[PDB]
């Protein structure tokens, strides 16, 4: 227990190292698909239009 | 005559279609297609085609076979249903010029107007441009060579009007628009260097291989034009261009001022907010 | 008395024959026929897909000339297409993409030949440019309302198929009138070719052309949409010369809906584009 | 200068833009023209009597 700390502690270090470049796919993807979406939903509005009040 | 075409990816995706009910023949050889588009107007407008019964034979080159009954009934009933499109030429899928391309050009050149030609690859592998407008126009050669039809590169591009980019922007749902700003140029300015290695470094080899081992004269006289074109840059010392490095320079310069600037100005809230926000979260947390 | 969960394969070649249809899609009422082939109970797969000429009729079953459609479907037959019809198709333009009681008379006319008598109806006309999302129509059984209507197993895709969600069709006229799922598929060949031709189609032609403009515009027209951004700029922090009163006052609550970051962030981006191209003119300078 | 506004005659209002084969001389106000159903694109105009 108080030596099976450190080797029992390196698993979490891997599993919170992991995250780093899942984080970082997640970031770089994620605002992607948001000028994705945001060309998508701003080529919407188009030039012919009626001119209410 | 014609400056410059307009073919829509539709006929490409017909070339597909070829491509797709061959049925596992084993043959896959240049199948020849109607090419069809709108000849009033000065450009060229490629809306829809269709196909051609078209063999040739193994040994000798100067078979083909073609038919006029069909493309007068596909052309009768096309034209019935959508009249403002005409016949204006065809299209081989082949990625070789062979000689008999002049006796299948010259039916369609008979009985049709001036018909344009189109060279494509059997696989998407090549990386350039697929579609090249080889115009069928016979010129008149200064080393007194007999007057031959003659393939004149006219340039082309792949644009669609209405709804075709729609429909192939939802089939694909992976492309990206133009977008600019970082990725969109970044990537352009890292495999533009590879877009024009293949094509230049694919082009210097069979180039420098034909130019000792080469016969059947290839018109040389564009040679001269080639490398004087080459050499229309003479590894200038860039003296007088130290003045036009300052002025790019200090635009620079002010991209500098304008990042450090507008960061700085953005800092604003963020700076601001991560002191204001955590001392009164953690002073009324508890 | 059995039934199946169909689902219909849509591909390109239909897609872009219904978006060059739709182009030509005349308010005048359209006729079309579909083709494929029947492997086995509940699929089906559509391959050819051609126009037909219009007329002051419109859709009805005397506008079809059978000699006309035995007769190309016979020279689809001496050609390398061994497909048999599938359904016929047409567009519904202004009144909605429902079906009257003639389309549904030459539908009941139509389908006793083939049971399935997949039905599709386009109108890019009032359809926004931004979706081009397509739904296939379907025939139901006048005998069947003493039992369930629709027994079909595989209740996930109904999600999808729950896309068209207009509170006026789907259950204003459910009755007697239901749809079906769509699906697509693309091999390499199309995904090579067609994504290729789509990056080509959004690039240039030797793709070193065009670069130099930009990078040598940079000191020319570019100059102009500096100052004009930086005059935006300016225009932008002669307000946020009033923001730390404000923020120096309330510090309570947000009442402009306005950022004043992102656009500035764009502006960054837009001005990146000379930093991105130095590097450009010093490969075109040095070789 | 490339996108205007168009008055119909039916009463409603709607704004048009620019076609690319045609020029700024008769694009000038006050000179009734034509539009299409699709797109609202101008082919020509339309001489007042
Ligand atoms: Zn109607």
Same mark, same amino acid.
Request: glycine share 6%.
């Given at each position: 227990?108080?030596?099976?700390?450190?080797?029992?502690?390196?698993?979490?270090?891997?599993?919170?190292?992991?995250?780093?470049?899942?984080?970082?796919?997640?970031?770089?993807?994620?605002?992607?698909?948001?000028?994705?979406?945001?060309?998508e939903?701003?080529?919407?509005?188009?030039?012919?239009?009626?001119?209410?009040? | 005559?014609?400056?410059?075409?307009?073919?829509?990816?539709?006929?490409?995706?017909?070339?597909?279609?070829?491509?797709?009910?061959?049925?596992?023949?084993?043959?896959?050889?240049?199948?020849?297609?109607?090419?069809?588009?709108?000849?009033?107007?000065?450009?060229? *407008?490629?809306?829809?085609?269709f196909?051609?019964?078209?063999d040739?034979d193994?040994?000798?080159?100067?078979?083909?076979?073609? *038919?006029?009954?069909?493309?007068?009934?596909?052309?009768?009933?096309?034209?019935?249903?959508?009249? @403002?499109?005409?016949?204006?030429?065809?299209?081989?899928?082949?990625?070789?010029?062979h000689?008999?391309?002049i006796?299948?050009?010259?039916?369609?050149? @008979?009985?049709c107007?001036?018909?344009?030609?189109?060279?494509?690859?059997?696989?998407?592998?090549?990386?350039?441009?697929?579609?090249?407008?080889?115009?069928?126009?016979?010129?008149?050669?200064? *080393?007194?060579?007999?007057?031959?039809?003659?393939?004149?590169?006219?340039?082309?591009?792949?644009?669609?009007?209405?709804?075709?980019?729609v429909?192939?922007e939802?089939?694909?749902?992976?492309?990206?628009?133009?977008?600019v700003?970082?990725?969109?140029?970044?990537?352009?300015?890292?495999?533009?260097?590879?877009?024009?290695?293949?094509?230049?470094?694919? *082009?210097? @080899?069979?180039?420098?291989?034909?130019?000792?081992?080469?016969?059947?004269?290839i018109?040389?006289?564009?040679?001269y034009?080639?490398?004087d074109?080459?050499?229309?840059?003479?590894?200038?010392?860039?003296?007088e261009?130290?003045?036009?490095?300052?002025?790019?320079?200090?635009d620079?310069?002010?991209?500098?001022?304008?990042?450090?600037?507008? @960061?700085?100005?953005?800092a604003?809230?963020?700076?601001?907010?991560?002191?204001?926000?955590?001392?009164?979260?953690?002073?009324?947390?508890? | 008395?059995?039934?199946?969960?169909?689902?219909?394969?849509?591909?390109?070649?239909?897609?872009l024959?219904?978006?060059?249809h739709?182009?030509?899609?005349?308010?005048?009422?359209?006729?079309?026929?579909?083709?494929?082939?029947?492997?086995?109970?509940?699929?089906?797969?559509?391959?050819?897909?051609?126009?037909?000429?219009?007329?002051?009729?419109?859709?009805?079953?005397?506008?079809?000339?059978?000699?006309?459609?035995?007769?190309?479907?016979?020279?689809?037959?001496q050609?390398?297409?061994?497909?048999?019809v599938?359904?016929?198709?047409?567009?519904?333009?202004?009144?909605?993409?429902?079906?009257?009681?003639?389309?549904?008379?030459?539908?009941?006319?139509?389908?006793?030949?083939?049971?399935?008598?997949?039905?599709?109806?386009?109108?890019?006309?009032?359809?926004?440019?931004?979706?081009?999302?397509?739904?296939?129509?379907?025939?139901?059984?006048?005998?069947?309302?003493?039992?369930?209507?629709?027994?079909?197993?595989?209740?996930?895709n109904?999600?999808?198929?729950?896309?068209?969600?207009?509170?006026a069709? $789907?259950?204003?006229?459910?009755?007697?009138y239901?749809?079906?799922? $769509?699906?697509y598929?693309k091999?390499?060949?199309?995904?090579?070719?067609?994504?290729?031709?789509?990056?080509?189609?959004?690039?240039?032609?030797?793709?070193?052309?065009?670069?130099?403009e930009?990078?040598?515009?940079?000191?020319?027209?570019?100059?102009?949409?500096?100052?004009?951004?930086?005059?935006?700029?300016?225009?932008?922090?002669?307000?946020?010369?009033?923001?730390?009163?404000?923020?120096? $006052?309330?510090?309570?609550?947000?009442?402009?809906?306005?950022?004043?970051?992102?656009?500035?962030?764009?502006?960054?981006?837009?001005?990146? $584009?000379?930093?991105?191209?130095?590097?450009?003119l010093?490969?075109?300078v040095?070789? | 200068?490339?996108?205007?506004?168009?008055?119909?005659?039916?009463?409603?209002?709607?704004?048009?833009?620019? %076609?690319?084969?045609?020029?700024?001389?008769?694009?000038?106000?006050?000179? %009734?023209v034509?539009?299409?159903?699709?797109?609202?694109?101008?082919? %020509?105009?339309?001489? %007042?009597?």
């Open positions: 227990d108080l030596y099976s700390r450190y080797k029992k502690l390196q698993q979490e270090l891997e599993f919170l190292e992991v995250q780093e470049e899942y984080i970082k796919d997640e970031q770089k993807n994620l605002k992607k698909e948001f000028l994705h979406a945001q060309e939903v701003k080529r919407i509005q188009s030039i012919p239009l009626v001119i209410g009040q | 005559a014609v400056q410059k075409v307009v073919v829509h990816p539709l006929v490409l995706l017909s070339v597909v279609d070829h491509f797709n009910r061959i049925g596992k023949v084993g043959n896959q050889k240049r199948v020849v297609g109607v090419l069809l588009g709108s000849w009033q107007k000065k450009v060229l *407008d490629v809306s829809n085609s196909a051609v019964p078209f040739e193994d040994k000798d080159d100067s078979v083909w076979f073609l *038919d006029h009954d069909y493309l007068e009934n596909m052309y009768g009933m096309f034209k019935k249903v959508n009249a @403002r499109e005409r016949i204006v030429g065809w299209y081989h899928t082949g990625p070789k010029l000689k008999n391309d006796a299948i050009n010259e039916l369609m050149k @008979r009985y107007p001036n018909s344009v030609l189109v060279i494509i690859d059997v696989k998407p592998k090549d990386l350039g441009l697929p579609t090249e407008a080889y115009i069928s126009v016979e010129e008149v050669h200064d *080393d007194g060579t007999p007057t031959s039809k003659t393939f004149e590169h006219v340039t082309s591009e792949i644009g669609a009007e209405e709804a075709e980019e429909g192939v939802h089939l694909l749902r992976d492309i990206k628009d133009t977008t700003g970082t990725l969109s140029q970044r990537i352009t300015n890292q495999v533009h260097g590879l877009k024009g290695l293949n094509s230049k470094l694919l *082009d210097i @080899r069979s180039y420098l291989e034909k130019v000792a081992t080469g016969k059947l004269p018109n040389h006289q564009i040679i034009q080639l490398q074109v080459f050499n229309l840059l003479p590894d200038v010392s860039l003296q261009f130290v003045k036009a490095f300052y002025l790019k320079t200090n620079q310069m002010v991209v500098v001022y304008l990042a450090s600037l507008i @960061r700085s100005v953005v604003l809230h963020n700076l601001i907010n991560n002191k204001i926000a955590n001392r009164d979260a953690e002073k009324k947390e508890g | 008395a059995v039934d199946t969960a169909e689902q219909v394969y849509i591909s390109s070649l239909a897609l024959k219904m978006l060059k739709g182009r030509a899609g005349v308010p005048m009422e359209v006729m079309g026929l579909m083709l494929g082939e029947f492997v086995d109970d509940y699929t089906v797969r559509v391959i050819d897909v051609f126009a037909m000429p219009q007329s002051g009729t419109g859709v009805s079953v005397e506008a079809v000339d059978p000699v006309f459609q035995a007769k190309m479907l016979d020279m689809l037959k050609t390398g297409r061994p497909e048999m599938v359904g016929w198709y047409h567009s519904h333009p202004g009144f909605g993409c429902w079906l009257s009681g003639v389309d549904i008379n030459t539908q009941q006319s139509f389908e006793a030949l083939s049971e399935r008598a997949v039905a599709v109806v386009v109108d890019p006309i009032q359809s926004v440019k931004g979706k081009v999302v397509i739904d296939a129509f379907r025939l139901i059984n006048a005998n069947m309302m003493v039992l369930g209507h629709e027994p079909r197993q595989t209740t996930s109904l999600g999808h198929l729950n896309k068209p969600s207009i509170q069709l $789907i259950h204003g006229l459910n009755r007697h239901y749809s079906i799922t $769509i699906n598929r091999n390499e060949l199309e995904q090579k070719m067609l994504l290729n031709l789509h990056k080509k189609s959004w690039m240039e032609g030797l793709t070193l052309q065009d670069y130099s930009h990078c040598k515009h940079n000191e020319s027209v570019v100059k102009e949409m500096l100052e004009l951004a930086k005059n935006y700029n300016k225009a932008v922090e002669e307000e946020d010369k009033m923001t730390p009163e404000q923020l120096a $006052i309330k510090n309570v609550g947000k009442q402009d809906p306005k950022r004043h970051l992102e656009e500035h962030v764009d502006v960054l981006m837009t001005s990146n $584009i000379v930093q991105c191209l130095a590097a450009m010093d490969t075109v040095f070789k | 200068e490339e996108k205007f506004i168009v008055k119909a005659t039916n009463g409603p209002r709607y704004v048009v833009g620019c %076609r690319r084969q045609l020029d700024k001389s008769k694009l000038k106000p006050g000179t %009734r034509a539009l299409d159903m699709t797109t609202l694109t101008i082919m %020509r105009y339309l001489p %007042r009597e």
